[PDB]
Design a protein around this ligand. Structure first.
Ligand SMILES: O=C(O)CCC(=O)C(=O)O
Ligand SMILES: O=C(O)CCC(=O)C(=O)O
Ligand SMILES: O=C(O)CCC(=O)C(=O)O
Ligand SMILES: O=C(O)CCC(=O)C(=O)O
Ligand SMILES: [Fe+2]
Ligand SMILES: [Fe+2]
Ligand SMILES: [Fe+2]
Ligand SMILES: [Fe+2]
Lengths: 273, 273, 273, 273
């Protein structure tokens, strides 16, 4: 059966009505192409279970186990984000999930488990649109440069365990990813740096890299490049983590908020033409 | 009868269900206090007429006639915003409506007349929240300063008529408004500069004013400080223009978009303690 | 006879000992090549007269008459800069002399007439060195762009006469000059924007032009790119105004300071390879 | 005998003619008050020896031994700065000597041992003047704040030994110094942060501290606030390291440059009124 897809804007974003029980190949194909046409998709009234989410995640590709965040009961592929006073939120910043690994995840699945009165809002900005918005000379200047990503930027040492930390650190040293990434599947061009992990553009002077990142970290903020989602229980968010950045509002404390995430591994980011 | 009010976030924003036919004193009182508790309120399925909107506007205070934007049929108090290729949108920037007059409007009413496929989105950021987010030393530093607002910043000469322009210019010279405004009614403290008109903080060095405005124009961007509304026909937006800024996405061309606005005059902005 | 040339640094700057009575062709040739090898040259103990300076200026090319600054007795080609309380200094900013004309001056001659106790210092920064300091990708990005220069930026309306002003304005509208200029004679590459007149790089988005100019206006500040001169009576400064920017300290008021300038016209700035 | 003192500008800077053989109490008193009236003083033709310099240093206060830089023959109080290709220069940045210790040095003595063709230039900017240049509201805002200084900022780990490094690190953890310091002796007010070590103003939001430091690190750059010295063999530089910042040009490689420094300990920086 056809899926009900309502696009949330001219660029990134959309909402659907399917039936998450496993998906009938034919639907998962519509969904996939959906999570591809719009970088993010939202589904409401889907009270799934950890074991159930991981199943859906696999339908896209192998999963990833976060080296820091805690996992669900007996499902290490499904990250549990339980925030409150004894564990404040640390996703109130523009970042692209796990880019400190050679092959950053090409997608993830968020399940709205337990929510606060209001707030907790999460936004997604499109790298593709952001890129199309760059003047030609800038597209040239950026296409080809490489930027360093450091897991320690969004997971500093002082906030940590300090033995379990050092472990994840040495196992995830800083690496390089193209400033302008080409989509494995769509082949569309998109900006690929995120305030969350990008430390500096390695192919320009320190002051130059500094200047360009200030611009870019801001540039991706433009409201036209994004979508905002007001959480509701048992909501489901699926997005293409290879051409987007997202922010999660930290405005619900002291209340509690519980979210489950399925991290999906992708290939190696690369640029083309 | 009580009104259905659903708050869109911990700070700014909310949605209601009333009956806009004129309001029963008792309701207008709930609405007023609503447009006061949350800086913005949204109502859907309200196919009013220009004459009808202006009526509702008056219920708050005297109106204002914009010296540039065109008016409705036989209602000069209701501004008509018809955008398209022959008249591109010029509200894709953080601004507070008409602050280039000694007594900037304390409110406005937007009617979603004719909409495009998607986009056109409009966001509102809260000056009150933005202010509470400033460290103490900054609150001190800002509370008391004055900033110049110039109608020519958001309505440059080159985009113009050039005789009707010069007229509105000379009749609306640059003036000063406190950087930190106190709410006439709530008495709450709030930042009161907007990238749209604020040219420089007159009480600090040029480089200092420059530095502070960069920070502030950015500071008000923080997602936690705002609400985003996805337009739908016959939607109604009412907001307190004395403690907020708003942005209207320019991502619907070549399509057309029609909006009616009721501008409501307020008193003279002032700071206190 | 050979001239005594002492270079003030690895890049821009140097000091000489000649005899300014007119120059013997052979010397003027050494001087020219001097004012070419180092972008600026300084000569002390040269008590020349206006008529005498203009003579020396001509030896390089036709002169220029500034449309605003006042001229000497009966020599309109020699600008007189008499600063004090009733006429504060307006050259305390990085600028390249007269770039708001299609063919900005390729040189100028400054005569230290009457000096204050100390201060009044003047610095010169090298566009050539500044350019060599740009990473390759930046050199590419910049080489080719065009920037608008507006005489009104460094000579605003409010500081003015307002009839003599409007005259110079209409006769010197904003125009374009390459962001990266190639030297008519040396053929060396150099940055060619100056905080003094450059308003925006016309070939990139407003936010992009804004970002790049912030970087550049700062970049040219790097101490390695400059020379500083501590004025002394009857001192003479000659510099290549087509590959440099200069700043004149405003730290001598209420005292008085008198300087004579010979402005020399150059060809049309252009880029190459 | 009276000393010949020629001030290099209205603020910071000056040149003298004494006789450095030990100083006759009476002269050292003139010199001291000199290195106090102008923040920096320069003496030429003074071919002293390490043992000889340290002697002069002591005349001011106890010395300091740098935990990283190498020392002279048998004089650990006199730092030897020998730069070249196998040891590039690392002082091409605005910094105030050793502020990563609770009681940063109140002075230092530089001896121009062996110089390159040209370049190597060193500049000093005055914190006192820079402070007087801040608008009142800014002086208030800044006076009282505290900023963190981290020895690791100007001596990163990656550039290192890594055992001798960790040693100096643990023995010199980040600490706090007032953003606005009051002079122990003169009692004058002065800005006290330096791009070299200041990491963030601890008493404001991260984005606020970030904004203020950008302004300040730039503010101290203003040419009016400084003095520039063109090195010559056997030159001597003495400056008040508690109200100044200095920069040393890195533009002489591959050539070699040798400098000796006497670091003098001062009291604990504090603010007053
Ligand atoms: O809590 C949220 O809504 C999102 C957290 C986040 O950034 C993530 O799960 O990657
Ligand atoms: O078109 C819109 O939605 C809003 C335009 C706007 O800023 C205004 O009407 O003040
Ligand atoms: O007064 C000075 O030393 C220089 C003024 C200046 O910029 C000029 O004459 O172009
Ligand atoms: O090499 C120089 O002239 C100065 C080096 C420096 O900053 C210092 O010795 O503190
Ligand atoms: Fe995330
Ligand atoms: Fe508006
Ligand atoms: Fe000039
Ligand atoms: Fe130093």
């Amino acid at each position: 059966e056809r899926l009900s897809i309502t696009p949330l804007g001219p660029y990134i974003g959309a909402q659907i009505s399917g039936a998450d029980r496993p998906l009938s190949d034919n639907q998962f194909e519509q969904l996939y192409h959906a999570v591809l046409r719009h970088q993010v998709v939202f589904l409401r009234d889907q009270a799934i279970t950890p074991q159930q989410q991981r199943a859906l995640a696999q339908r896209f590709g192998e999963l990833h186990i976060h080296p820091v965040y805690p996992h669900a009961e007996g499902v290490d592929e499904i990250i549990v984000l339980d925030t409150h006073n004894d564990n404040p939120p640390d996703n109130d910043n523009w970042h692209t999930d796990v880019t400190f690994i050679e092959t950053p995840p090409a997608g993830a699945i968020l399940a709205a488990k337990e929510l606060p009165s209001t707030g907790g809002d999460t936004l997604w900005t499109s790298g593709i649109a952001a890129y199309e918005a760059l003047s030609v000379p800038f597209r040239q200047l950026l296409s080809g440069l490489r930027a360093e990503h450091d897991f320690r930027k969004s997971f500093p040492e002082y906030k940590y365990e300090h033995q379990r930390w050092r472990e994840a650190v040495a196992k995830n040293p800083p690496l390089l990813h193209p400033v302008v990434r080409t989509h494995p599947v769509s082949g569309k061009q998109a900006l690929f740096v995120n305030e969350g992990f990008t430390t500096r553009i390695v192919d320009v002077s320190e002051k130059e890299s500094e200047a360009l990142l200030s611009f870019l970290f801001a540039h991706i903020t433009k409201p036209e490049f994004q979508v905002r989602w007001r959480w509701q229980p048992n909501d489901i968010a699926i997005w293409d983590n290879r051409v987007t950045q997202h922010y999660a509002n930290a405005d619900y404390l002291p209340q509690r908020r519980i979210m489950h995430r399925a991290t999906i591994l992708g290939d190696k980011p690369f640029y083309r033409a």
